[PDB]
């Protein structure tokens with residue numbers, strides 16, 4: 001697979017590292033919808049609002065099967081560590097019109 005998962009479940013936003021590469025989710029949007037990182041980087045999404053959200057990569061993007069991230073409540077976080085160069089699109093399971101991508105250089 002093309003990413004590893006440091007936290008299987010959502011975790012508290014207060015425990016996101018200071019350093020971390022963060023994508024906020026707010027107002028029904030990913031607030032960095034075209035994020036550029038490098039091989040080896042960890043990305044952390046943080047839901048900033050009451051409406052639940054996730055991140056969801058369809059089958060074949062990060063692995064043979066889909067990666068459907070866990071449901072994230074307000075001030076919950078979820079991370080992926082990207083290990084292979086490429087561009088990886090995702091959406092929100094609940095709200096598929098909400099889309100983003102991670103461009104891994």
Ligand SMILES: [Cu+2]
Nearest residue numbers: 053092094095
């Ligand atoms: Cu959503």
